[PDB]
């Protein structure tokens, strides 16, 4: 029946939601199901052809008052349920991409419409981040500031690097005593640990 | 009289006050245990020693007397933290004291806490002991009660409310009981002196320590070593136990799904099977099909359609061992079998009984036979029912039963018996000196593509998740090929029992891709691989 | 001792309320009385435990957790119900002192047990 | 956009942040009274006009900032003493349904001051650490009795601390919402 | 007006915005004044730095503490705008609406809402709706078998704490009646059940949102 | 801890039969039919006729209970939530007031039969229902010190009664029950029937009555108040004479007792 | 009950028994035969998103809904005897959603009373297992295999809250 493919597709949305929720660090949303979506759209095209043929028979006068009305109505419901399934799946993957855009601001699994969508949303984020309200780093940390000064140990040999506060030389397994407001970005990037 | 109160007070204050850093660990444990209706506490000896060594000294001198006092202290603390009724709580201990080997326990250790280890070899059924017990007095019909505790009692004779010499009886209608179990511990195999059979002990546990272990497991035990009545002035020893020590994730199935969409998965799985063996491509393909299997079906009129696969092989020793290793469930045997049951089953004798061979035992899994020609006479006829029906039925000497034989058979040898198998092939050899030299070098090394475990888990996943169906195009293709071969043979046999085998091979081939429908791609490879000859 | 009587009264109320069990008593009695004048059905009745739950929870849990104190008085009440209903006169010597009361049985929704 | 675990609730870090804005009494060891602090979210006069060993009142986060070094000492709140906690435990036992009238931030402030200011108390700390535990356990019993009255309409609570409410929030609200959904569906 | 009072108002707005189900109106004036103050304080810190260490430490960490709250607040509001985009657009399109969208949202929020709606519309319109028949091509359809527009759950349960009138004018508040021998109180009617409750000053409650919306707007209660 | 927060005729009869028995205390209201009047009166009359017949045959309380109890479900139901049954019972009693207030013999016979029916129905109650019904009627227990001072005499008085009436053959059981039993003090003239049988202890003109006895006081109060109401009902029989359609029914009802 | 909610999308696909009240041409594909009519008093199992409409639209509507097995009398008695021990996961994965949908459809009064008691009684043991934090696996695991998909979310969001508070405190 016409809803089986949608019932199969939505299970992938539930699966990827649970996989994403289990581990926030391991976000790689799986392959876009091009084939199942194509099959669903082909089914919708078949139903459209059936409705058009039924309209031709209605214009021919083939008991069109009762027979065409009920058959057309039942077909319309079948199309609407497929629309709901497709929109739900795409909306879930859109939400995951929106979550990733805020932190970042690789591509192979995304469909090309989604590939341009992510670029558009990154442009929107940097537009908000610029201009007025620039003084607060909207993409910054959401954990309240606990301490000014911390001790951080050097995890990866990135060599000498530049930062707005100054310059660091990340000699492997050396330790700094430095203010957190400087090294917050480098901790997020993963060069440093708090010990 | 006062000493019983001071000791209880001391242990009560122990539970209420022991912090390590910032958490009252035992108050938290005792609260968290009650919420899941677990009435016990797991104390650690080292913390008790750290808190106050005198309490540990008292506990070490006279365990049998002092353990109940600490238990009732646990109850008194348990009521405060949860009530503005509960049973008596069980104390459980952990320790790191030096293990005594089981062979060295002797008269110096009676009524001492002992830590030992071994292998559990037997387990009794559960039995009932009394804790609170009510009493009726026969003459005057007065009533009273008694509280038992299980440490090393009989009904009293001080009649009350003359009242007689032995007037008391039990009201089981208003009494409380607990569980009890017996176990046997055998000394460790790598500790026995040479040329002797291993020594063993018997032991007891109750309440939450019951039903915690099974036969054959190596364990560590903490318990009181004591004696009981059962020569002159001689008694048997035993131990009272106080402590014992002994489906897919999402990230797993993601790897299996990535493998499923590989365009060359069939080649990869064939290459991964017995990689040392040179050549023999179709043998490896057939073993893949045997491992994966078809799809079971049940019809409205009750007829039942088989899923298993059967293969025969006419170097060959290695492949059966590999199949044993890779398969989720596997049994290995030679043609004569492990007993007089042979392969299938037999009746033996004194009253008669029945036992099954290595076809009943492998039910639900795979079975591999090392030399099919050494099959016994009864098995030669019984394997017909074992393979066609997946059952074995016997009516002999008053026995009348039927046995399940749901399994896939692999076999090798070196006649009409070949008809039972879905595919038959003959092993082939090649004699490259480099191969032998490499094998010899590896042998000297020990003397001086997908891995097995991953492949086994993948096979399990595919068996659990999918069971595909034929498409109509495959049906037309197969029927046309069937009538074509029968007509060709007529003008110059194929039968329905082989068409239904080709269908199973087709389904097993479609199973690898996790495609819900089988297709002409699979039908072509099925008939291509059908060339046993 | 006094609690025994009240439980008999409460089960009598139950037997009067749910009338389908009176019909069972009477049908067994009249069937046995008919063929006696010429097989015999037992003096046993099966009650639905759900009816007893919906009638009185305290009696239901009493039956299901303390059977030794609740099953006997209910059986006594059933025997009283069957005895008060009309019966054949002039019983024989064996019938006069048979020591044979009616007996109960249960069905439905045991839950955890 | 916002993380999933912050859609409906405050994390304990935010609860600590909220509590830190309260005032607290201190003894400074240095005189600042005649640069100046020039704060923008608080009063600035108190810090600019400090005199050594003269009691004064400042926000808690600056107080902990000073106490990190030698320049300050923190006076404990008056409720955080053995006599008062004894009386509150007796109140808890006496009235088996009402909650005792402790301040809304008692757990958070106790577990901040025991870490940052262990040396400034008058009572022995190892007794306070026990009496706090007693109070929390009794309150947990009273909470566990209360969850049998979740209903379709409302509930009343009194003197329940902020952290205790935040601990329970997602359970109470969810179960109450589903009971509301079941009830209103029959009306419609 | 003072710098001390603005931060208390900011904390109030942040806490209320986190819990309530609907999108509350933007404080237009407070944000202007706060952001100007942040800029001036940053320049002052730079000037004093270029000119005892401890006062500078206090000033720096205070500015960090101030910026964090605003960051969290704006992120929460944008998250709400994501979920009710079609609802807000429908509210704006209604000519008879009692409130305009620009009253509710800030200018940056207006920009975000508009352009994000267009981006999301372009994604689904080409992918899915390009293939549907003309009867089902609408994205914000109300008439279908399932409503395509989401909106707030006005009956969500929320914790509250009763403050009373902010000025302490218990004698002036017209709604604030009095219970027997005790504190003043408010009264509210819950209409599905046809029942009343008395909300005494100082006591905590779990209450439906719509029943207490008006008192929340008047600052008679505060969300916990 | 957590915390949340005509019709009048039907309510009147629900109140009147909450206790499951009534002294028939209050004026009925609303309407019923004349067929209902006749039939309800005849049903109660049949039950009371059988009660008087059994008493004339000198049958015991248990025999009368065995005879009369099956008739409630047919004629005059008892222990019932039905408004119809409750109204039937109440109205039938009130009708037989007007039938049997006419003469001293009729008043005595009606009081005797109705009081015995009251006794029968009271026996059918549970002890909780009996306690609630007695308490609803606004009906002096002795102090523990007075019980202790008179304990020997009271126990000597009631010990035989405990054995025979409450089946407490064991003296131990009798002692425990007596320890748990309460006693009532009142003038001896109020319980004189128990005095004549020496079932109560007398001291200074007061009779000491255990709690498990004393139902005769309740039934005697019922009989006395019913007699006074019947005397009152007799005095305003001229107002009954305004409706001629009722007098043949009452004459028919009274004819079975004459 | 949002549009894009996955669980609501998935719950609507469960099938319910149905019976027809008119013969209709060409709709035999519901009976898995596109080339034939449907006939009156035929019985079929249809998904809820379709049966919810065909039961309403006219007069006599096209389809009548038969009482499904998941709301049978045996289930109700099992609920009312011991709600805590009940294996609702085996009965139906989405019980409390379909219950509310059915109550809305038919405006049942007694079923609501039963379901409210069931939810309230199971929430107690759910909170008990939520509160119990290690400083055990089998005792918790036996009960948590009998939770609905609806109840698992509440359990997870309660457990994480308690765990976060404990971690912050003892730190
Ligand atoms: Zn005795």
Author numbering:
A (entry chain C): 1 to 105, 119 to 208
B (entry chain 5): 21 to 104, 131 to 198, 205 to 213, 235 to 303, 320 to 335, 348 to 415, 421 to 455, 460 to 524, ...
C (entry chain 3): 18 to 55, 90 to 164
D (entry chain D): 2 to 35, 48 to 201
E (entry chain F): 54 to 104, 122 to 294
F (entry chain A): 1 to 5, 44 to 177, 181 to 299
G (entry chain E): 1 to 58, 68 to 144, 158 to 193
Publication text:
Pol α-primase is a constitutive heterotetramer composed of a dimeric primase (PRIM1 and PRIM2 in H. sapiens [human], Pri1 and Pri2 in budding yeast) and a dimeric DNA polymerase (POLA1 and POLA2 in human, Pol1 and Pol12 in budding yeast). Pol α-primase binds directly to the leading edge of the CMG (CDC45-MCM-GINS) replicative helicase via a complex interaction network.
To assemble budding yeast replisomes associated with Pol α-primase for cryo-EM analysis, CMG was bound to a model replication fork containing a 39 nt 3′ flap, onto which CMG loads, and a 60 nt 5′ ssDNA flap to mimic the unwound lagging-strand template. Fork-bound CMG was incubated with Pol α-primase and the replisome accessory factors Mrc1 and Tof1-Csm3. Pri1 is positioned close to the incoming parental double-stranded DNA (dsDNA) above a channel between the Mcm3 and Mcm5 zinc-finger (ZnF) domains, through which lagging-strand template ssDNA is extruded after strand separation. Pol12NTD binds the Mcm3 AAA+ domain in the MCM C-tier (site c), where helices α8 and α18 of Mcm3 form an electrostatic cradle into which α4 of the Pol12NTD docks. Site d involves the N-terminal 5 amino acids of Pri2 (Pri2Nterm), where Pri2-F2—invariant in fungal species—docks into a surface-exposed hydrophobic pocket on the GINS subunit Psf2.
